[PDB]
Design a protein around this ligand. Structure first.
Ligand SMILES: Nc1ncnc2[nH]cnc12
Ligand SMILES: Nc1ncnc2[nH]cnc12
Ligand SMILES: Nc1ncnc2[nH]cnc12
Lengths: 268, 268, 268
């Protein structure tokens, strides 16, 4: 049995995607999640939706409680966590409106807790050095890619996301530099969300939606406009992907993830 | 009517530049500014001078209250903010003593608040994603460049400033790396000063004075020596530039800046 | 007379290396050191050993009190501080088990105090801008290199260490990027340890032990395994190097270090 946690980004957190909805506020050892958890289903698969920035988008990327969000979904019994996020394109071929099933990231954040094992919580004892060679679940990404193809959507099979601290957008010099580093898209929320999901032994995948070409220009109005015009794509992709995830066996994949997380912890 | 805020850097914060001076200590929602505001004039133009590190230079770059400084100048009615800063040269052609009217930056800071919209101040509500494609005012930079030419000063028309966290200087490996990234000069204070000025809808420009070639070596004594030998240049440039700024119309430029800042804010 | 401070890293902090041991808990203006100081000798040379992560390895890299550790050793009268650290190799020629006498670093840390002069301690007044062109002591590194040769150990004479914040390991995209930046090895503790030692006017050198090839894959178990298999190398190197350090004159080298540190401080 699988359970899909869904974290919705800016303008990509529609509750109506779930059938048989029930609101549920929870608490965690790391604090309160961005907003209430929305329990429901897509066909016969159980899901838990959560708005990353709150339903009214009042939380900036740097202040999102990534620890509480991931811990809450883990506590609900989620086996997978598929998220949505807007991003700027750093490559001509990645056009606004395109979907990118990212497989790598480059961290440019500075003031964000990236581990549950901070030495101050009894629920997470020891020092954890989680491997990040392959940050996103290959199997989950594969289903997303094939479903996008079945839907006939413009979708890139891989891509490197550079996550900046924000809330400001990048300068032109920074934008050029990121391209030379090998970054393909840019956002403000992938890190540490992907890191914490790995520590939790959860299958994590991200649906990145290009909304602009950054400035190599971007603005909040441009981002919001493109999201409004393309939100249906992420919704259709999730609706079609999830029942497919639920029809396959994940015990082995989840076992390997649990082992990796478990053996990354150094106890006294 | 224009009003020029002037933020003086290390050894480039001479109060005598202003005529008819009056000291004024102020407070802001973000705390106290580095020191008192010095009100005065250059010809018929009103100005407000502020020492970035305090008159006795007791504040390190990472602890400067950039938010309070910019907010105080904005509250005084400043339409422009022209600053001075020492920097290391990362290019052979930029010689110590040279002035660089920088047009871009690369952020290497880590523990600095970069927005007024942090969710804890009623004076700045919402999430702000300010555009940084063109961080510095083109029109203000243009006047500085032409005035430098009229004065016959060695001045570079553009340049990318990499702002490091400090207080330590860069290692040789870091110095080499910054050159490959496309950085031309290096300092410790441009970011987030330039970011906050943009959020405030103020025309911001920076007079960077090269004092050394970093280590691709630099020392505090070398920096102080070069500043003492060349401080008169920044003073003469400001004295000649400001009356020129005051003789032109800025309502349209300021309107466009206000619009950009206003529409960068996401309200609940 | 010399006194060698030794900071032992993960699995490279064996107390038995010292003869005539005596445990000593101390306090500093910056807080408590990672663990108690172990006083003792190697031949006729006085030494002070300190486990970076605590004897039971309960402190993550980002939470190590680098300020207290360096201050404690300085207060004990240490003239030199030679440390050990595990690291990942970013170059084919640097094989796991190899020693690298690093000479440069690239900072990728974000939430770490890098100076004693933070404006809140009477023991360290003013603003300090310490030079980092040559972060490690050349003379100390030279003795380590020659001793490694006399022992017939695979040892690299130089290398650039990129210090990441951690506790997570790097992503593959980050690993590739670090190689293009010119990094040779990667760890989580060199910065700011090397910076604070310089401010303290102490001769600092690092014995980096490659334990894996990062992911250009690494895991805690792989790291621990390689350290267990090669720990004897660092121990033998220290035992043979230290008596050699004690047989030479260091007054001039220490005087030059004291001058550099002293003149890096800007007083009110
Ligand atoms: N260009 C951009 N930079 C950062 N985050 C973004 N989100 C959407 N577009 C973005
Ligand atoms: N080389 C340098 N690095 C950083 N800040 C500086 N200010 C002056 N020279 C500098
Ligand atoms: N690959 C690696 N990255 C960071 N720290 C390490 N310590 C040992 N191997 C490492």
């Amino acid at each position: 049995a699988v359970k899909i946690g869904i974290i919705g980004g800016t303008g990509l957190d529609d509750p109506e995607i779930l059938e048989g909805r029930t609101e549920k506020y929870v608490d965690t050892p790391f604090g309160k999640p961005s907003d209430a958890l929305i329990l429901g289903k897509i066909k016969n698969v159980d899901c838990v939706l959560l708005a990353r920035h709150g339903r009214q988008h009042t939380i900036m990327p740097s202040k999102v409680n990534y620890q509480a969000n991931i811990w809450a979904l883990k506590e609900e019994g989620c086996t997978h966590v598929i998220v949505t996020t807007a991003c700027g394109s750093l490559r001509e071929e990645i056009q606004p409106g395109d979907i990118v099933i990212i497989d790598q990231f480059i961290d440019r954040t500075t003031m964000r807790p990236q581990s549950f094992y901070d030495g101050s919580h009894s629920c997470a004892r020891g020092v954890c050095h989680i491997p990040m060679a392959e940050p996103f679940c290959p199997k989950t990404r594969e289903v997303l890619i094939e479903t996008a193809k079945k839907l006939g959507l413009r979708c890139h099979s891989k891509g490197t996301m550079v996550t900046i601290e924000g809330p400001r957008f990048s300068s032109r010099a920074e934008s050029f530099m990121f391209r030379t580093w090998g970054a393909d898209v840019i956002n403000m929320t992938t890190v540490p969300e992907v890191v914490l999901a790995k520590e939790a032994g959860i299958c994590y995948a991200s649906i990145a939606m290009a909304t602009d070409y950054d400035c190599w220009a971007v603005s909040v109005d441009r981002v919001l406009k493109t999201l409004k015009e393309n939100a249906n794509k992420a919704k259709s992709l999730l609706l079609t992907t999830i029942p497919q995830i639920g029809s396959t066996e994940w015990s082995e994949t989840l076992h390997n993830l649990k082992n990796m997380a478990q053996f990354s912890v150094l106890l006294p």
